[PDB]
Amino acid sequence: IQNDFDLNTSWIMNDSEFPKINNSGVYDNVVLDVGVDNLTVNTILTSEFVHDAFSNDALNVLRGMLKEWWDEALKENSTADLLVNSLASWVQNPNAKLFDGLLRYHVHNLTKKALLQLVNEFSALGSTIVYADRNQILIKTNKYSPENCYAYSQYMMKAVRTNPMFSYLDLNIKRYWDLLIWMDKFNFSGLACIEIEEKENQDYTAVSQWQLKKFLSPIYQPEFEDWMMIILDSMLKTKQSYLKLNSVENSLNGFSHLFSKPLMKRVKKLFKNQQEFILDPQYEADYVIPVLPGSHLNVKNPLLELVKSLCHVMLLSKSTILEIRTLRKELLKIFELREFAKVAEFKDPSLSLVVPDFLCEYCFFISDIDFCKAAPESIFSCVRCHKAFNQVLLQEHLIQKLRSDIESYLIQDLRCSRCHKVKRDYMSAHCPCAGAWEGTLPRESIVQKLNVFKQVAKYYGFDILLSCIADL
Amino acid sequence: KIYPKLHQMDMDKVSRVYADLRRESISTGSFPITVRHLESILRIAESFAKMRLSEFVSSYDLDRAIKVVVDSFVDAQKVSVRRQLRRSFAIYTLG
Amino acid sequence: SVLAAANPIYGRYDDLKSPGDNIDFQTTILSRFDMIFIVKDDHNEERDISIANHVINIHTGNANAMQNQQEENGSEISIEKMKRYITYCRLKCAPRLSPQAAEKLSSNFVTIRKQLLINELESTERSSIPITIRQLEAIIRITESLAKLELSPIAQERHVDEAIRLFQASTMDAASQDPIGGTSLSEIRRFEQELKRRLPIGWSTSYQTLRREFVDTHRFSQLALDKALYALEKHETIQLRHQGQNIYRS
Amino acid sequence: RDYFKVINASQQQRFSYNPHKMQFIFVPNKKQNGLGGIAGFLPDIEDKVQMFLTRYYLTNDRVMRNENFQMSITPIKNLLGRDAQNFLLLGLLNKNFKGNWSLEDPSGSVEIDISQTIPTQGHYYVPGCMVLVEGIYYSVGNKFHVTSMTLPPGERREITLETIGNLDLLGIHGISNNNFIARLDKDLKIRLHLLEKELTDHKFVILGANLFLDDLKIMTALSKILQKLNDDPPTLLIWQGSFTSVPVFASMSSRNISSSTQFKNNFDALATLLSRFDNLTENTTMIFIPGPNDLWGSMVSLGASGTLPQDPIPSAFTKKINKVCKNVVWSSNPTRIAYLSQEIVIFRDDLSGRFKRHRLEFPF
Ligand SMILES: [Zn+2]
Ligand SMILES: [Zn+2]
C-alpha cells in the first residue's frame, strides 16, 4: 500500500518546520543565555480512534531499549554512549532501514510539546522568555546586577534538573547580559560578561552584530557604528546613574538628552555633503547601493535609510516612546517630509530562506540554517565544530525544499470568500451562499519564493540549482 | 465670505487614526464610531481654518481638530481604562 | 416599484440577540418584498483603511479629476444617457422563459423550501422571514429583468444563474442566517471533554469513525455535526483540511 | 524518414471545450505570449475547478452522440420532487465526507444504493469513473436504489474526427491559433499511400521497463542486444522504465558517493557502451522515458506515485549522451509522436494493481 499516494502521508512528511519565540525590546535587567542538550533523548524517555498514531508497542519497546542503553552507558561504556548519541541521527535519516515517517512525526510533535512545557515551567517563577529554540534559550532575570544572580541561577538550574520530566536535560549557562538591545537573532547589541567572578569587577565586552548595516551605503556605515556605540554608552551611563540614585523604568528614561544636538548637527552636515557630492562622477563610488541576496527594497536616498535604521533601533525601548517619536520628527524635519509619510516607514531590508534540520555528522548536531540573513563563513561550516560542509548536499536540500514547496502549493485546498468553509464538492460553480473560491496558498507568495531562490542561486555559485530552475 | 480649502493634509495620519478609533470602541466598549466622525474631523478642521479668516487648511488646524476629537472620545469611558487609552492615543497628538 | 430603507430595533442588529425580535415587521408586509438586504458593520482595519482612503480622496479636492477619467476611458456612462437607455429598454424589450430555465427554477424552489423546513424543524419556531410562491415569482421576474438588460427576446441559463446567485445572497444573508439563534448544553460539555481526552494536539481522526462511535453511544448523529462545526467556528484548536475527512486539532 | 515529429506533454497544444456551443476552443500558450522570465508554468486557481467540468462535458457529449442514446438522462437536481419512478443518470461515483457512495453532477448530488446492483461484467468499477446508473428514487430518505450499472460505451477515431472535420490538434502540416481554425484532409490519403510503401524499412523497436544501469547482468544483456541490433539499425529506439533501481533523494552522509553523482555516473557508462556500436548511433534515434523513481519524482515522492505530467530527465545529468549520439530525445511520462498517418501514445506506469486493490465490491 505504501507506494500509493495519500494526502495524510504527504502532509506528515513535509511538515518539518520548528516554531520559535522572539520578543523584541530593550532590557535593562540581567539576562541569562542558557543552552539545552540531549532534548530528543529526554523526550523519548519521558513520555484505533486516532489514525495518525504510531504503534505504542514499538514506542515502549524502544523506550525500554533506550533506558537500558542509558544505564549501560552510565557504567563506563563508550560504545553505548556513542550509539545513544547517534540514535537521533538514525531517527532523522530515512536511508537507514526500518525507517518510518510516522515515528519521525510523532517524535517531532512530542519534542515540540516538551519544549513548550519547558517554557511553561521556566515561566512559573519570575522570568521572561526573550528567545526560544531547540538549542538556545534566553531568560530575563528580575535582578539588576550580574553579581547577585549566582545562587539564583544555580537554584533555578537545580530545580529544573530535579523535575522528573527534565531529569535527563543538560543545562549550561554561556553568557550574562548586563544591558541588551534585542530585536532578532542576527540583530542585537549589548554589554556581556562571560562568567561572574568573586571579589573582582567582571570583565565587560560589548558586541555588535547587525546584518542591517550591510544594506547601507559604503559611506554611512562608519557613522552607523559610531552612533550605535555612542547611544549604547549613553544607555549604560544613564542606567548606572539611576542605580546610583537608589510600563515606565527610570533606568533609561532620559538618555537621548545627551546627544540630541550633536546628532542634529551631524545629520545637517551629512545632508549638505550628500546634496553637494551626489551627482559628481568621481564621487559616485561611495553612494552605490550594495546588493545582497534576499534584498527587495528599491531606494534612492541613502541618508533616509540611515536615519530610519537609527530611529527604528531606538524605537525598541517600548518605555520612552514619546521622546523617540519627538526626536524622529525633528530628524524628519531636516528633510522636506512629514511624520506619517510612507517613505518614512522602516521595513526589513532582507527576506528569509531557512533550511530546517541540517545535520553535521561530525557532531550529530541539529540546527536550522538561513541562506539569506546569516553571514558567510557560517553557511559552509558547523556552528559548534569548524568543519566545512559539503556543498552539493546544500544544493540538493535546496532543490528538495523548492520541489516540496511546488507540490504543496499544487495540492492545496479551496476556501470560500465570505464564509471560510472548505470546498466539499468535486465540482461546483461557487459557494451555496455568495462568494467565489480562493486558494489557501496565494500565488504571489510562491512567486516571491521562486524569486528569492533565483537571488540565492545567483549570489553563490550553484550550477545544479540553476539547471534545476532552467528545466521549468 | 471665507471658504477654506483642503489640499495639503496627511492622508495616512487621519486614515490610521480612524482605523484606531474603529479598533477598541465597540470591540472593547460601547461607544459607536462610524464614517460620520471622519467627516466630523474634516469639518472641525475647516472650522478652525475659518476662525483665522484663511482660505486654506494648515497642519496646525488638523492637529487641533484631531486632538479635540480624540480627547472627547477618550474622556467618555470608564475609570478602569481611561488612563490606558490616554497613554495609548498619545502618539497622534504629540505636537 | 418600492425601495424602502429601515433600521432594526436596538440600532445595531445585535447578532447575539435572536433574529425574531430584531425586526418588528409582520409576515404579511415582508412577503411582498423580495430582496431583503441586511447590511452589517464590520471591523478588520483593512476595509476600514480602504474606506477612509476612499472618503478622504472623494473630498472634492481630488475626486473632481478622477471621475472625469472614468468618462474618458469609457469605464462609466453619464446619468442622462443611462436614463435614455433605461426608458428605451423598458419600451422595447420584454423577454420570455425557456423550459430548461423553468425546470431549474422549479428545482431551486423545492430545494430552498426543504431547507426552510429543516431550519424551522431545528429551531422550533416560525421563521421571521417567510418563503412562498411570491418568492418564485420574484426569482422569475429577476431573471426576466436580467435578460431585459441585453434586449434578448429569450431568457437563458446565463441570466438564471446570476439571478439565483442574487437570491441566494439575499436569502442566506437574512432568512437563513444563524437559524439556531445561539438535550440542551449538558451534552455539549460532555462531548468537548471526550475530544480533549481522546484526541491530543497535532493528531487527527477520520470523521466517519467519530460519527460511528458517537452514534453508537447516546450522542447520535444530529448532535455531533452541530457542535463539530461550532468548534470549527471557534477555530481555537480544531481545523478542517483535505475535504470533510481530516479533523485536525490545532 | 522525415515528416514525423515527437511531442511531449509540456509543448502539447491547449484546446478548451465549451458545452453551450459544442466546439473545442483554442487557448493561447503562456510560453509564447507570456514573459516566462521568472515563473509562468504555475496554473491559476480556477483550472482545478474547471478540469472536472471539462471531463464531464466531454463524457456527456460522447454519451449523447451514441446511436443507442438519442434514453434521455436527467440531471441529479431534478430528482428532488418525484419518487417511485425509474431514471437514467451519470456522474462522478465517489465517497462523500460522511463515508457513503454518492453521485456528483454539475447540478447536485444524491446518495446511492448498492445492495441489489447487477453490473455489466468486464469493467473495473473504481471510484472516480463516470458510470451510467439505473434505478428508482425514494423520498423517504435520499436513497437511489440502483438495479444496474454500466460504463458508457466508446467511439472510433473516424466518427470522432468527422464531428470537427479533420482538426490539426496534433497538427504537423499546420497549426491553429486564436485568430483562426484550420483543417486538412487532402494530404491524408497521400500520406497513407506513402506509408504503404517502405514501411518495413522504417521499423521501430521498444524494450521492457525498469532497466537498471547499475547491475552487471543488465549491462551484459544490453550489450548482447546491441551487438545484434548494430548490424541492422532500426528507425526509432525507445528506452523506457526507471534507469536506477534505488530512488534518489537527500544524502545525509558526506563519506561516500552522493546519490546525484552516482545518478550522473550511471549514464556516463552508457556513453562508453555506445562507442562500439557506431552503426546504431549513426542510423537510429534514441527515445528516453522517465519511470516512477527518476530524479524529479523520487526527489519528493521517494519512489511512490505522484504527479502524472513528469518532467523529462534533467539536462545536467545527460551531458555526454547528447554528444555521443546525434539523435536523442527526452520526453515526459505521457508522450505523443505523430507519424505520417499514425499517432502513438506511450504511458509508463502500473495499472493492474491500482485497479485490483481499489476495485469496488458488490454484495451478491
Ligand atoms: Zn559540527
Ligand atoms: Zn460562502
UniProtKB/Swiss-Prot annotation, chain A:
A zinc finger (CysA-type) spans 360-385. In eukaryotes there are five DNA polymerases: alpha, beta, gamma, delta, and epsilon which are responsible for different reactions of DNA synthesis. Present with 1970 molecules/cell in log phase SD medium. Transmembrane segments: none annotated. Zn(2+) binds at residues 360, 363, 382, 385. [4Fe-4S] cluster binds at residues 416, 419, 431, 433. DNA polymerase epsilon is a heterotetramer consisting of POL2, DPB2, DPB3 and DPB4. This is DNA polymerase epsilon catalytic subunit A. The DNA polymerase activity domain resides in the N-terminal half of the protein, while the C-terminus is necessary for complexing subunits B and C. It is found in: Nucleus. Belongs to the DNA polymerase type-B family.
From Swiss-Prot, chain B:
It comes from the Eukaryota. It is found in: Nucleus. Present with 1690 molecules/cell in log phase SD medium. Acts as a component of the MCM2-7 complex (MCM complex) which is the putative replicative helicase essential for 'once per cell cycle' DNA replication initiation and elongation in eukaryotic cells. The active ATPase sites in the MCM2-7 ring are formed through the interaction surfaces of two neighboring subunits such that a critical structure of a conserved arginine finger motif is provided in trans relative to the ATP-binding site of the Walker A box of the adjacent subunit. Component of the MCM2-7 complex. The complex forms a toroidal hexameric ring with the proposed subunit order MCM2-MCM6-MCM4-MCM7-MCM3-MCM5; loaded onto DNA, forms a head-head double hexamer. Belongs to the MCM family. This is DNA replication licensing factor MCM2. It comes from Saccharomyces cerevisiae (strain ATCC 204508 / S288c). The gene is MCM2.
UniProtKB/Swiss-Prot annotation, chain C:
It is found in: Nucleus. A motif (Arginine finger) lies at residues 31-34. Transmembrane segments: none annotated. It comes from the Eukaryota. Component of the MCM2-7 complex. The complex forms a toroidal hexameric ring with the proposed subunit order MCM2-MCM6-MCM4-MCM7-MCM3-MCM5; loaded onto DNA, forms a head-head double hexamer. Interacts with CSM1. Present with 10300 molecules/cell in log phase SD medium. Early fractionation of eukaryotic MCM proteins yielded a variety of dimeric, trimeric and tetrameric complexes with unclear biological significance. The MCM2-7 hexamer is the proposed physiological active complex. Belongs to the MCM family. Acts as a component of the MCM2-7 complex (MCM complex) which is the putative replicative helicase essential for 'once per cell cycle' DNA replication initiation and elongation in eukaryotic cells. The active ATPase sites in the MCM2-7 ring are formed through the interaction surfaces of two neighboring subunits such that a critical structure of a conserved arginine finger motif is provided in trans relative to the ATP-binding site of the Walker A box of the adjacent subunit. This is Minichromosome maintenance protein 5. It comes from Saccharomyces cerevisiae (strain ATCC 204508 / S288c) (Baker's yeast).
From Swiss-Prot, chain D:
GO terms for cellular component: cytoplasm; epsilon DNA polymerase complex; nuclear replication fork; nucleus. Phosphorylated in a cell cycle dependent manner during late G1 phase. Phosphorylation may facilitate the interaction with POL2 or the activity of DNA polymerase II. Phosphorylation is independent of DNA replication but dependent upon CDC28 in vivo. Keywords: Cell cycle, Cytoplasm, DNA replication, DNA-binding, Nucleus, Phosphoprotein. Its main location: cytoplasm. The keyword DNA-binding applies. GO terms for molecular function: DNA binding. The keyword Chaperone does not apply. GO terms for biological process: DNA-templated DNA replication; DNA-templated DNA replication maintenance of fidelity; error-prone translesion synthesis. It comes from the Eukaryota. It is found in: Cytoplasm; Nucleus. DNA polymerase epsilon is a heterotetramer consisting of POL2, DPB2, DPB3 and DPB4. Belongs to the DNA polymerase epsilon subunit B family. As accessory component of the DNA polymerase epsilon complex participates in chromosomal DNA replication. It is required during synthesis of the leading and lagging DNA strands at the replication fork and binds at/or near replication origins and moves along DNA with the replication fork. It has 3'-5' proofreading exonuclease activity that correct errors arising during DNA replication. It is also involved in DNA synthesis during DNA repair. Present with 3110 +/- 251 molecules/cell in log phase SD medium. This is DNA polymerase epsilon subunit B.
